[PDB]
Design a protein around this nucleic acid. Structure first.
Ligand SMILES: [Er+3]
Ligand SMILES: [Er+3]
Ligand SMILES: [Er+3]
Ligand SMILES: [Er+3]
Ligand SMILES: [Er+3]
Ligand SMILES: [Er+3]
Ligand SMILES: [Er+3]
Lengths: 174, 176
DNA sequence: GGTCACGCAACC
DNA sequence: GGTTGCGTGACC
């Protein structure tokens, strides 16, 4: 008949909910234009949020923040190339710290021009198009080992299904 | 009563704030009130840090980055708390980023590898040669797996700012 | 083990 | 009239 004790342990639990609640308010008051009533901190937090910002894609992190992050953890850069004709479609600015010669001899040049001669035949096999492809090749600046991972997406939300393009990122192999 | 109004108008702000979060509605509405705050500050922390460090297809780029990568992105702090887990964590481990962020990283790691990971957190200048981490670890998986899907963290530990000077592991998860 | 909502006693 | 915390219970 000491159930009050176990219901006194219930109090301890509900208490942490407060501390965790309040502790977040304090945390949520350090990422705001201040050093205060909690409610005010929540209204100001809503204000901050709305200041930061058919189908539309929300994101914890923007393209700049992802681009950067990947570029930091792995030395990876994005590129989209045309699935058959060696035609580059896009290359992020992250091709500068990984490799050099950004956005000039990669801008309109064929992806086959940026690889080794002895890798062309091994690359066209990836681009048969006869869903996700990954490989490794040797890239220009003399040469470095690049691991490439990505998927195939076409370039022209349905119920059944959707020239194609290889959308992939390449990072220094290790 | 006046206490009922207190809690009520205190709640409506949590609901608005939650609705402003950058997740699908499916998950927003099932958010625990505490989770709302917790992750809501995780967001602002990430934004601060990125503002200090970073101080038309350019848009499609991010999406392409998440899918093109054979894995997901992870940011952990020395406190061993996921500063960030990319949306694609669901695609390889069956966890929704919503419920991974600001939760002990150790609730995703196998007991055996938990130790090695703890050692990888703590080994220092900004871009030293040291504290480049490339270690293998098994992480819980919820897909049809046998649990504990084995994969390989390749990342570069660097200094974490914007919070208040702690370190942090920024890494990529390579499943193979 | 945990959430959410009560109502209470403080205090500006 | 406000907000800060506390111990309960119902409902999972
Ligand atoms: Er009883
Ligand atoms: Er690097
Ligand atoms: Er050229
Ligand atoms: Er349709
Ligand atoms: Er919870
Ligand atoms: Er975008
Ligand atoms: Er074992």
């Amino acid at each position: 008949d000491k159930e009050r004790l176990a219901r006194e342990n219930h109090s301890e639990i509900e208490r942490r909910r407060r501390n965790k609640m309040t502790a977040y308010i304090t945390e949520l008051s350090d990422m705001v234009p201040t050093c205060p009533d909690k409610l005010t901190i929540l209204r100001m937090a809503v204000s901050h949020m709305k200041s930061l910002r058919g189908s539309y894609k929300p994101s914890f992190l923007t393209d700049q923040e992802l681009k950067h992050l990947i570029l930091e953890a792995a030395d990876g850069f994005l590129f989209i190339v045309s699935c058959e004709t060696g035609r580059v479609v896009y290359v992020s600015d992250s091709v500068t710290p990984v490799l050099n010669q950004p956005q000039s001899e990669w801008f309109g040049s064929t992806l086959y021009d940026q690889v080794h001669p002895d890798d062309v035949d091994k690359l066209r096999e990836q681009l048969s198009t006869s869903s996700r492809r990954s490989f490794i090749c040797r890239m220009r600046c003399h040469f470095v080992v690049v691991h490439c991972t990505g998927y195939i997406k076409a370039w022209p939300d349905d119920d059944p299904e959707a020239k194609f393009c290889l959308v992939a990122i390449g990072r220094l192999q290790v | 009563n006046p206490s009922k109004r207190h809690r009520d108008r205190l709640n409506t702000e949590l609901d608005r704030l939650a609705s402003l979060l950058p997740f699908p509605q499916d998950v927003i509405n099932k958010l625990d009130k505490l989770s709302v705050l917790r992750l809501s500050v995780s967001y602002l922390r990430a934004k601060s840090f990125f503002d200090v460090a970073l101080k038309g297809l350019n848009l499609q780029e991010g999406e392409f980055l998440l899918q093109a990568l054979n894995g997901f992105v992870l940011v952990v702090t020395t406190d061993a708390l996921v500063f960030y887990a990319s949306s694609t964590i669901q695609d390889y481990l069956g966890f929704q980023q919503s419920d991974v962020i600001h939760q002990s990283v150790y609730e995703l790691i196998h007991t055996e590898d938990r130790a090695e990971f703890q050692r990888q957190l703590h080994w220092p200048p900004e871009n030293s040669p040291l504290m480049e981490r490339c270690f293998i670890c098994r992480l819980r998986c919820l897909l049809d797996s046998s649990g504990f899907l084995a994969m390989n963290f390749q990342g570069k530990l660097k200094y974490l700012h914007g919070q208040k000077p702690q370190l942090a592991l920024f890494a990529i998860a390579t499943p193979l």
